[PDB]
């Protein structure tokens, strides 16, 4: 089997991408944030505290003839940005782009943190990291991809995120028309539960490539590119007037600037992020100070190849017995 679904930016900045997901019988379609940095499929629901729902579409398990309470199971998650959610668990039928999993754990939110309530466009998350990170207790549950894997034509999914445009998540096949050149594959460590890999270096604009190992995670659920402070300083030094602002929370730059590209290495291959992809717009409405899309990871504990980096590539998440990642230009 295969599936293919379009993913759409939630706003004009590409802050996140939403993909329609069918849950239950009859289907209830919710727009979920596919997140290769986590491993829970959780949704706003009829159980979510009413004051914490503001415009999201909810899953109502009592209206699904295939929903079953997973007795005794609870979940609770905290994300790298400080947001969180928690609740109980149902199993139900879940379909993405024509690919159907029966008995998928659907984690129903009883509580969500304010950042989720305040974003009416995201109805929940669909985790695509390794199932070892799933938070369901006392019986850990499998991700949608883990459940689908054995049925897929090939045990892979691909992310093809658009810049200011829709893109595609495919399951079970590699669309050879969706990229240019060849796909370069690189080793993955699953020891932390992430799609963790080592970039071979970087370049700023037309500058020389610096060969240096940068360990990080491929994370579709993170907006920006978070890299070591040395790398980030080297980038922003090429933008007149750019500076790190403690009050704003990262590098800002004059909105009048033209940003240089940023290249990262994948083996001997190179992925070029155009400068425009690094512009996240005014820090507040009407400001002439703009927020940068490349930021320091120093306060995180891990480097993160988020959407800024991934949307410059066609990315293969190869879930074979020994997983690997593939990157192609597009």
Q: What kind of experiment solved this structure?
A: X-ray
Give the distance, in angstroms, between the CA of residue 282 and the centroid of all CA atoms in the same chain: 23
Are residues 106 and 133 in contact, defined by beta-carbon separation less than 8 angstroms? no
Q: Which of 64, 85, 95, 199 is catalytic?
A: 199
CATH class of 175-330: mainly beta
Whole-number Å distance between alpha carbons of 200 and 190: 19
- As to burial, measured by CB atoms within 10 angstroms (0-12 exposed, 13-18 middle, 19+ buried), residue 284 is exposed
- Residues with Cβ within 8 Å of residue 56, at least 6 apart in sequence: 44, 120, 122, 123
Whole-number Å distance between alpha carbons of 261 and 209: 12
Whole-number Å distance between alpha carbons of 53 and 30: 14
Q: Which of 14, 33, 35, 307 is catalytic?
A: 35
- Residues with Cβ within 8 Å of residue 207, at least 6 apart in sequence: 238
> Which of 195, 221, 223, 169 minimizes the C-alpha distance to 19?
169
Give the distance, in angstroms, between the CA of residue 164 and the centroid of all CA atoms in the same chain: 16
> Which of 317, 321, 323, 262 minimizes the C-alpha distance to 295?
262
Q: Is 35 a catalytic residue?
A: yes
Whole-number Å distance between alpha carbons of 8 and 176: 21
Sheet holding 250-254, edge to edge: 243-245, 250-254, 289-292, 279-282
Whole-number Å distance between alpha carbons of 303 and 241: 25
Question: β-pairing, 167-171 with 99-112?
Answer: unpaired
CA distances from 213 to 131, 199, 200, 210, 303 (A): 27, 6, 5, 10, 11
SS3 sequence of the chain: CCEEEEEEECCCCCCCEEEEEEECCCCEEEEEEEECCCCCEEECECCCCHHHCCCCCCECHHHCCCCEEEEEEEEEEECCCCCEEEEEEEEEEEEECCEEEEEEEEEEEEEECHHHHCCCCCCEEEECCCHHHCCCECCCCCCHHHHHHHHCCCCEEEEECCCCCCEEEEECCCCCCCCCCCCEEEECECCCCCCEEEEEEEEECCCCCEEEEEEEEECCCCCCEEECHHHHHHHHCCCCCCEEECCCCEEEEECCCCCCCEEEEECCEEEEECHHHHEEEECCCCCCEEEECEEECCCCCCEEECHHHHCCCEEEEECCCCCEEEEECC
Whole-number Å distance between alpha carbons of 93 and 104: 6
Whole-number Å distance between alpha carbons of 97 and 206: 40
Whole-number Å distance between alpha carbons of 194 and 192: 6
Query: What is the structure's resolution, reported in angstroms to one decimal?
Result: 1.0
The CATH number corresponding to 5-174 among 3.40.50.300, 2.40.70.10, 3.50.50.60, 3.90.550.10 equals 2.40.70.10
- Domain parsing of the chain, residue ranges: 5-174, 175-330
Please report the sign of the dihedral spanned by the C-alpha atoms of residue 62, residue 67, residue 71, residue 73. negative
Please report the sign of the dihedral spanned by the C-alpha atoms of residue 22, residue 23, residue 24, residue 26. negative
Q: Cβ atoms within 10 A of the Cβ of 90, count?
A: 25
CA distances from 327 to 173, 186, 208, 324 (A): 15, 8, 21, 10
Whole-number Å distance between alpha carbons of 173 and 151: 12
């Amino acid at each position: 089997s295969t599936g293919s679904a379009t993913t759409t930016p939630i706003d004009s900045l590409d802050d996140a991408y939403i993909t329609p997901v069918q849950i239950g019988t009859p289907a209830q379609t919710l727009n979920l944030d596919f997140d290769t940095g986590s491993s829970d499929l959780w949704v706003f629901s009829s159980e979510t505290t009413a004051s914490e729902v503001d415009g999201q579409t909810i899953y109502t398990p009592s209206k699904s003839t295939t929903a079953k309470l997973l007795s005794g199971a609870t979940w609770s998650i905290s994300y790298g940005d400080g947001s969180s959610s928690s609740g109980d668990v149902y199993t139900d039928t879940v379909s993405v782009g024509g690919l159907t999993v029966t008995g998928q754990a659907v984690e129903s939110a009883k509580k969500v943190s304010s950042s989720f309530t305040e974003d009416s466009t995201i109805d929940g998350l669909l985790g695509l990291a390794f199932s070892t990170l799933n938070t369901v207790s006392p019986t850990q549950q499998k991700t949608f991809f883990d459940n689908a894997k054995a049925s897929l034509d090939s045990p892979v999914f691909t992310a093809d995120l658009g810049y200011h445009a829709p893109g595609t998540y495919n399951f079970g096949f590699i669309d050879t028309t969706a990229y240019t050149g060849s796909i370069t594959y690189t080793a993955v460590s699953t020891k932390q539960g992430f799609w963790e890999w080592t970039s071979t270096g970087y370049a700023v604009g037309s500058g020389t490539f610096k060969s240096t190992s940068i360990d990080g995670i491929a994370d579709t659920g993170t907006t920006l590119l978070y890299l070591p402070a040395t790398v980030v300083s080297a980038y922003w030094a090429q933008v007149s007037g750019a500076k790190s602002s403690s009050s704003v929370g990262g590098y800002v730059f004059p909105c009048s600037a033209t940003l240089p590209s940023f290249t990262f290495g994948v083996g001997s291959a190179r992925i070029v992020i155009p400068g425009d992809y690094i512009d996240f717009g005014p820090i507040s409405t009407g400001s002439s100070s703009c927020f940068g899309g490349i930021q320091s990871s120093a306060g995180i504990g891990i480097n993160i190849f988020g959407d800024v980096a991934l949307k410059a590539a066609f990315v293969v998440f190869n879930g074979a017995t020994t997983p690997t990642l593939g990157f192609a230009s597009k």
